[PDB]
Amino acid sequence: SKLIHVPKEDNSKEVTLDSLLEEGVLDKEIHKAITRMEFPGLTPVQQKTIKPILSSEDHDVIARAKTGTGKTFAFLIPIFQHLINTKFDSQYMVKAVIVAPTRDLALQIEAEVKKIHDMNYGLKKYACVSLVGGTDFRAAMNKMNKLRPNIVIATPGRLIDVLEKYSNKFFRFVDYKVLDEADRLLEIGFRDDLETISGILNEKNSKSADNIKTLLFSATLDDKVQKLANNIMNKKECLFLDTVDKNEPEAHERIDQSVVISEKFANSIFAAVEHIKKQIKERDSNYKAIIFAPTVKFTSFLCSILKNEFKKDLPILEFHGKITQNKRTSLVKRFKKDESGILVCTDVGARGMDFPNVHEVLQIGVPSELANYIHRIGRTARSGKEGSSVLFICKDELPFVRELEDAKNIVIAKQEKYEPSEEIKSEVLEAVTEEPEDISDIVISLISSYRSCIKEYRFSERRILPEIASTYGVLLNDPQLKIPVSRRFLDKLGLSRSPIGKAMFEIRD
RNA sequence: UUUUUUUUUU
Numbered sequence: 001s002k003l004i005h006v007p008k009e010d011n012s013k014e015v016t017l018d019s020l021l022e023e024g025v026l027d028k029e030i031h032k033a034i035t036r037m038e039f040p041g042l043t044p045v046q047q048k049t050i051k052p053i054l055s056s057e058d059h060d061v062i063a064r065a066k067t068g069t070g071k072t073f074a075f076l077i078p079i080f081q082h083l084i085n086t087k088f089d090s091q092y093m094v095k096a097v098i099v100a101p102t103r104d105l106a107l108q109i110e111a112e113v114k115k116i117h118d119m120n121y122g123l124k125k126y127a128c129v130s131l132v133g134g135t136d137f138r139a140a141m142n143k144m145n146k147l148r149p150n151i152v153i154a155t156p157g158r159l160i161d162v163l164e165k166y167s168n169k170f171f172r173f174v175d176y177k178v179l180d181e182a183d184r185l186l187e188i189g190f191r192d193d194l195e196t197i198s199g200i201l202n203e204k205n206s207k208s209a210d211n212i213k214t215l216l217f218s219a220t221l222d223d224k225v226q227k228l229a230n231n232i233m234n235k236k237e238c239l240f241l242d243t244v245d246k247n248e249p250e251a252h253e254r255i256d257q258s259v260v261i262s263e264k265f266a267n268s269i270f271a272a273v274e275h276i277k278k279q280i281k282e283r284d285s286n287y288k289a290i291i292f293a294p295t296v297k298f299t300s301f302l303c304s305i306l307k308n309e310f311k312k313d314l315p316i317l318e319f320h321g322k323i324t325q326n327k328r329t330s331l332v333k334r335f336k337k338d339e340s341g342i343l344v345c346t347d348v349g350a351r352g353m354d355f356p357n358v359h360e361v362l363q364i365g366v367p368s369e370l371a372n373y374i375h376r377i378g379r380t381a382r383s384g385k386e387g388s389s390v391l392f393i394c395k396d397e398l399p400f401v402r403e404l405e406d407a408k409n410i411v412i413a414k415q416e417k418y419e420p421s422e423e424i425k426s427e428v429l430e431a432v433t434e435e436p437e438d439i440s441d442i443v444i445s446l447i448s449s450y451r452s453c454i455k456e457y458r459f460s461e462r463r464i465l466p467e468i469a470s471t472y473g474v475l476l477n478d479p480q481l482k483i484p485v486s487r488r489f490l491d492k493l494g495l496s497r498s499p500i501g502k503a504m505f506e507i508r509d
Numbered sequence: 510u511u512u513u514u515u516u517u518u519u
């Protein structure tokens with residue numbers, strides 16, 4: 001299908017809510033709702049995308065805009081307008097399906113729809129229901145029946161669950177599907193699900209298999225996403241609306257980025273603790289930060305350390321996929337409103353989540369995918385605010401920083417070295433209450449995660465894997481100690497005849 | 510000795 005590039009333009013006429021109203025693109029009722037939010041104007045992505053999404057042309061839309069620049073309302077606004085435009089047709093049916101890669105992001109988008117409802121009660125008739133995992137299925141279906149929503153927000157697993165059973169009842173008149181964080185939803189592990197979703201919606205559609213228009217939004221996408229999306233894009237033409245230059249880096253330029261390089265992976269823990277200590281002192285505890293970590297087990301561990309160091313100074317919140325969904329939702333609600341605190345999380349929190357006035361994003365180790373560097377640091381410097389980011393890595397992780405330059409054109413100007421004092425090591429290690437078996441579980445989780453990104457980040461396996469494994473000895477304060485394991489375990493992992501494996505593990509069976 | 514998420518509260 002034909003990709004029509006509309007690149008970033010410098011001197012184009014400003015689009016406003018009033019101008020869209022006067023032109024007849026927006027109804028008074030949606031104009032009202034957004035106006036009462038009292039935004040200075042519409043963000044570039046909003047100015048660029050609202051009219052084309054609503055256009056009577058037979059096209060799909062792809063939109064790139066940097067983190068925190070209003071992509072959500074960029075699709076919610078025209079969606080509401082479409083509901084108003086067709087308000088007498090199929091009024092009890094879902095007309096827009098919005099898909100997101102995490103439950104908390106889907107629930108956030110639902111909360112944004114609710115903000116529109118609250119700014120004009122006249123829009124409550126265009127109801128919305130979220131379909132996400134970890135919530136009561138029956139209770140959600142009762143809500144579908146009671147409210148008969150025109151907008152569904154969902155995560156892929158639960159949506160498929162619902163579609164396999166109820167696609168005929170609610171989903172035969174869908175006109176739009178939106179993939180928020182589209183590049184993530186088209187990666188392995190989501191792509192098959194999005195193709196299943198798209199296939200069901202297209203099959204069940206009462207007009208035709210090509211009726212549904214598809215909108216793709218992300219801070220990170222290019223021409224290659226069209227290929228990946230080929231099986232789910234129905235229309236003969238695709239409009240690519242870009243608010244970023246082709247050779248311009250996708251990272252938000254307002255973010256003051258730095259990297260702190262240690263000799264050992266474990267030393268990044270001490271570096272982060274000292275950094276947070278300094279920030280709490282210098283900002284007089286007026287400090288709101290997010291710290292990312294590679295695995296669930298390590299995130300949980302890092303949270304324990306940070307509570308011991310800092311719970312007296314600030315709240316420490318633990319956020320990952322093994323936290324119950326009720327608790328995930330309450331901590332998201334709290335961190336959105338809190339002035340200060342530290343959110344400790346996995347990449348569950350890397351994309352989309354809008355926590356106002358985060359001062360700093362910290363990272364211990366590398367993200368789960370290259371693009372997530374940009375999304376992680378984009379949790380700060382949102383909606384015109386300032387922000388900083390610090391990447392804490394060890395020397396053997398440096399090829400990641402080179403790949404950011406080579407692949408994504410991101411050059412981190414501020415780079416410095418770190419070496420922990422014996423004092424900070426003793427302070428941090430003494431409060432660790434984990435048993436050796438727990439430390440083994442934690443470090444093994446790191447070995448497995450780092451192993452899966454060796455090719456992507458161009459790591460040297462022979463250096464990175466022993467370095468990660470050596471974290472076990474460092475945390476037990478005995479550098480020559482190796483991780484005790486069984487031969488069957490080493491066989492499973494695939495390192496039983498390797499010198500790399502012998503440097504990491506001791507076969508204490 | 511589940512590597513980030515993602516139905517299985519249908």
Ligand SMILES: Nc1ncnc2c1ncn2[C@@H]1O[C@H](COP(=O)(O)OP(=O)(O)O)[C@@H](O)[C@H]1O
Pocket residue numbers: 039040041042043046065066067068069070071072073352353354382383
């Ligand atoms: N026109 C606007 N002017 C100022 N702030 C806005 C505008 N539209 C949305 N916002 C705010 O910007 C923040 C980030 O929006 P979001 O849609 O999450 O960004 P993105 O999805 O592009 O990362 C939200 O708090 C939202 O209320």
Ligand code: BEF
Pocket residue numbers: 065066067068069071218219351352353378379
């Ligand atoms: F690009 Be955003 F932080 F959803």
Ligand SMILES: [Mg+2]
Pocket residue numbers: 071072180352
């Ligand atoms: Mg977003």
